[PDB]
Amino acid sequence: DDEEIEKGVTSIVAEVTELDEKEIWEKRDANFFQDLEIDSLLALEILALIEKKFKVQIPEEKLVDITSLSATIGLTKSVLAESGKLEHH
Numbered sequence: 647d648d649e650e651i652e653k654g655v656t657s658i659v660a661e662v663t664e665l666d667e668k669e670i671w672e673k674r675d676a677n678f679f680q681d682l683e684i685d686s687l688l689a690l691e692i693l694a695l696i697e698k699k700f701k702v703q704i705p706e707e708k709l710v711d712i713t714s715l716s717a718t719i720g721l722t723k724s725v726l727a728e729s730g731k732l733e734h735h
């Protein structure tokens with residue numbers, strides 16, 4: 647589910663980053679690194695929490711490209727479509 651995925655990924659990134667869900671969403675196209683924090687440890691943690699929410703295996707080596715909220719959402723959608731679990735409109 648499109649809404650469900652975009653909101654779930656937002657919540658996870660908000661947690662890991664200790665930022666507010668509305669701000670992270672407003673900054674959905676910001677670069678994850680430098681432009682506000684998020685390093686390889688935080689990206690690693692984002693990946694792991696997504697691989698718990700949605701029950702989804704993500705070979706854990708994209709973090710270099712877990713690079714914005716919208717990129718991260720897109721990654722989650724791709725992986726959900728691989729798994730036969732995406733309803734996309």
Ligand SMILES: [Zn+2]
Pocket residue numbers: 647
């Ligand atoms: Zn619905």
Ligand SMILES: [Zn+2]
Pocket residue numbers: 648649652
């Ligand atoms: Zn949307």
Ligand SMILES: [Zn+2]
Pocket residue numbers: 664
């Ligand atoms: Zn803290």
Ligand SMILES: [Zn+2]
Pocket residue numbers: 666667
């Ligand atoms: Zn708040």
Ligand SMILES: [Zn+2]
Pocket residue numbers: 674675716
């Ligand atoms: Zn966008």
Ligand SMILES: [Zn+2]
Pocket residue numbers: 685686687688
């Ligand atoms: Zn660090």
Ligand SMILES: [Zn+2]
Pocket residue numbers: 697702703704705
């Ligand atoms: Zn896995």
